[PDB]
Amino acid sequence: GSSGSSGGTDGTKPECTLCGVKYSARLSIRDHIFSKQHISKVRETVGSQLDREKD
C-alpha cells in the first residue's frame, strides 16, 4: 500500500527569526518591531556607520 506524502507546509507563528524573539500569543509583530529590542537588531544586523564613499 501507500503511506502518503506532504506537499505543503504551514506555520507562520508570530516570531522574529531575525531577533529570535518569538512573540507571545498576546504580543504582535508591531509591538515588537516598535521596540528598541527589535530596532537594535535592525541597526546591527546591517550597521549604522555610513559607507566610505556616498552615492
Ligand SMILES: [Zn+2]
Ligand atoms: Zn525583531
